[PDB]
Design an enzyme around this catalytic site. Structure first.
Site, PDB file in Angstrom:
ATOM      1  N   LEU B  19       0.775  -1.109   0.178  1.00  0.00           N
ATOM      2  CA  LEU B  19      -0.121   0.121   0.096  1.00  0.00           C
ATOM      3  C   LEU B  19       0.905   1.412  -0.161  1.00  0.00           C
ATOM      4  CD1 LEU B  19      -2.426  -1.285   2.833  1.00  0.00           C
ATOM      5  CD2 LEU B  19      -3.077  -1.262   0.230  1.00  0.00           C
ATOM      6  N   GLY B  22       5.706   5.399   4.016  1.00  0.00           N
ATOM      7  CA  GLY B  22       5.278   6.027   5.354  1.00  0.00           C
ATOM      8  C   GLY B  22       6.545   6.468   6.073  1.00  0.00           C
ATOM      9  N   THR B  23       6.635   7.281   7.156  1.00  0.00           N
ATOM     10  CA  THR B  23       7.711   7.699   8.044  1.00  0.00           C
ATOM     11  C   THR B  23       8.813   6.989   7.928  1.00  0.00           C
ATOM     12  OG1 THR B  23       5.964   8.940   9.329  1.00  0.00           O
ATOM     13  CG2 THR B  23       8.359   9.115  10.004  1.00  0.00           C
ATOM     14  N   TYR B  24       8.539   5.546   8.497  1.00  0.00           N
ATOM     15  CA  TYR B  24       9.638   4.500   8.491  1.00  0.00           C
ATOM     16  C   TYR B  24       8.543   2.970   8.000  1.00  0.00           C
ATOM     17  CZ  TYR B  24       8.129   4.332  13.478  1.00  0.00           C
ATOM     18  OH  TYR B  24       7.513   4.493  14.671  1.00  0.00           O
ATOM     19  N   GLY B  25       9.404   2.140   7.659  1.00  0.00           N
ATOM     20  CA  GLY B  25       8.688   0.973   7.223  1.00  0.00           C
ATOM     21  C   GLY B  25       7.945   0.875   5.963  1.00  0.00           C
ATOM     22  N   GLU B  26       7.026  -0.067   5.954  1.00  0.00           N
ATOM     23  CA  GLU B  26       6.175  -0.438   4.779  1.00  0.00           C
ATOM     24  C   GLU B  26       4.753  -0.853   5.152  1.00  0.00           C
ATOM     25  OE1 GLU B  26       9.669  -3.082   2.882  1.00  0.00           O
ATOM     26  OE2 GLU B  26       8.558  -2.423   1.069  1.00  0.00           O
ATOM     27  N   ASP B 128       1.791  15.044  12.345  1.00  0.00           N
ATOM     28  CA  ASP B 128       2.242  14.803  11.065  1.00  0.00           C
ATOM     29  C   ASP B 128       0.827  14.967  10.133  1.00  0.00           C
ATOM     30  OD1 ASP B 128       3.891  14.442   8.637  1.00  0.00           O
ATOM     31  OD2 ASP B 128       3.688  12.469   8.906  1.00  0.00           O
TER      32      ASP B 128
END
Ligand SMILES: CNCc1cc(OC)cc2c1CN(c1cccc(-c3nncn3[C@@H](C)CC(F)(F)F)n1)C2=O
Ligand SMILES: CNCc1cc(OC)cc2c1CN(c1cccc(-c3nncn3[C@@H](C)CC(F)(F)F)n1)C2=O
Lengths: 289, 281
Positions: B19, B22-26, B128
């Site tokens: 999808l 983002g800030t960190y990760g998937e 955010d």
């Protein structure tokens, strides 16, 4: 640093004695093996996985300063996880080391020091640098009675942590102006130095900064409160009207209203005639006897 | 996390499609193997940031904040199981659909303000707010997501450095209190309303470092809507009050919930379902 010496400085100097600590690491009095010239050697433990950004910022600040009222920078040495910063030795040490033997400084002695500190601050602020650690312990006196600002340790830690956090900031388009301010400036400016100098003037007059006997956390807390009153000189009749006002304008609670270093330099206290090194030579004569 | 599942979530779910980031990760779309139920799985490779993130999500029990189902940890991969939002972010939507209508904007702003009123009551800050972090489910309902910035601030805050006796009061202020509070989300909502109306936040075509410098520079003027005649006096006023430069004068989330823009009758998920029908063709 690009001009760092990849060798042990003890091959060129002999460590005579330990001068003190500081924000981080320690300072030694050292003698150049050939020329016999005295230097200050600041040593810090530089581990292999350590960030490096703080030490890099500190030597950058020192290396790019070319002013009489800021400690001279000679060079840096990296050897066996030890970083050594070579700086100018100041024969009388700090104002704190001095007043601890000598007692309170006279108004004229405080006035020369304030003017010399303001000259160094005006220079620093003009090249977008902040000392952030102005105090008696950080104001050094050489044998000639000259005044030098030292210990850019706090300044380097802030500059490094501000750059580090500016990498994780992201896009600013949705950020409120106050969020932008802490990201770029930490939420304050160079006028924090002007306030520190005002506290330093009291420290030199009374042998301790205001609220020295109050808990470090409590003093911070009281400053955050509404109706916080800026400190004043205790002995009202000991000091001139110019000294009381110098303390009043440097210790302006609102940074938007606090005068800059350049403005301060035209204040009556530090503008008066007869402010020269001789006033400090008289302080050092008392140190010696 | 004290409630973490120490196994691979792919024992219970089938990964369907990525999808986004983002800030960190998937984030991945996942389907429960037995019940067919859909979830969003946020995968982070591998400590206090992620702990503060799971804690922010676990302690939120509010309709306008993405539901938290649990976390998984297996072979250095942390998986955060949250609510799946069928229509994606408002950014995913407006990129196909074009500008939202004033009524669609008003409903979105009411929903976001309800979520922000809740967070602020729990002493949490999103930090955010933007179209990409405002998710829409199949029913047209609004949910705030990506607590990555909030977690990074929380973790950074957890770890003052000078000597207090010579410290200036504004310096002591930024150490004890912060350099900013929860009202920064209110400003971010004002920018998001312009973004929903114009397809981009103000000064999007300007270099980000320059944008940061204009903002800190005093006499910085708050942004306004570009097409004055397209929008009502209530929408213009909502932009003026959320975008107050002074944090002391900026209204709170519960104060903003009484504003005429977000108080008006006829604000419902049907306005967003009308928008999603436009996306479908
Ligand atoms: C406690 N007496 C100090 C003392 C006593 C003394 O007596 C003859 C001489 C000196 C000092 C210090 N000094 C020096 C010189 C250059 C830089 C720095 C420096 N650079 N970073 C932190 N520092 C200093 C401020 C830290 C610390 F802790 F040493 F003060 N210091 C002298 O030449
Ligand atoms: C770019 N389109 C996204 C998109 C498209 C879509 O289409 C049907 C569905 C979804 C998403 C996102 N999502 C979701 C759900 C829960 C949490 C999070 C989440 N938790 N932390 C960061 N996020 C999101 C905001 C980051 C990122 F990058 F994915 F947007 N995401 C969905 O259910």
């Amino acid at each position: 640093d690009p001009d760092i010496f990849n060798r042990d400085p003890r091959d060129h100097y002999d460590l005579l004695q330990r001068l003190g600590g500081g924000t981080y690491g320690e300072v030694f009095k050292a003698r150049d093996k050939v020329s016999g010239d005295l230097v200050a050697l600041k040593m810090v433990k530089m581990e292999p996985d350590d960030d490096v950004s703080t030490l890099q910022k500190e030597i950058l600040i020192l290396k790019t300063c070319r002013h009489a009222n800021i400690v001279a920078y000679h060079g840096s040495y990296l050897w066996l996880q030890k970083l050594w910063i070579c700086m100018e030795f100041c024969g009388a040490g700090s104002l704190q080391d001095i007043y601890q033997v000598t007692g309170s400084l006279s108004e004229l002695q405080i006035s020369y020091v304030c003017r010399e500190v303001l000259q160094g601050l005006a220079y620093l602020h003009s090249q977008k640098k902040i000392h952030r650690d102005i105090k008696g312990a950080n104001i050094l006196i050489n044998d000639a009675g000259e005044v030098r600002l030292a210990d850019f340790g706090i300044s380097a830690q802030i500059g490094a942590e501000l750059a580090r956090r500016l990498e994780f900031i992201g896009t600013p388009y949705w950020m409120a102006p106050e969020v932008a301010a802490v990201a770029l400036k930490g939420g304050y400016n160079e006028l924090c130095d002007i306030w520190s100098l005002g506290i330093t003037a009291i420290e030199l007059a009374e042998l301790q900064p205001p609220l020295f006997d109050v808990h470090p956390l409590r003093v911070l807390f009281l400053m955050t409160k509404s109706g916080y009153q800026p400190p004043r000189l205790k002995e009202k009749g000991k000091w001139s009207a110019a000294f009381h006002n110098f303390i009043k304008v440097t210790l302006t609670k609102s940074p938007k209203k606090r005068p800059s270093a350049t403005k301060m330099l035209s204040h009556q206290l530090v503008s008066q005639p007869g402010l020269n090194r001789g006033l400090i030579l008289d302080l050092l004569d008392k140190l010696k006897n």
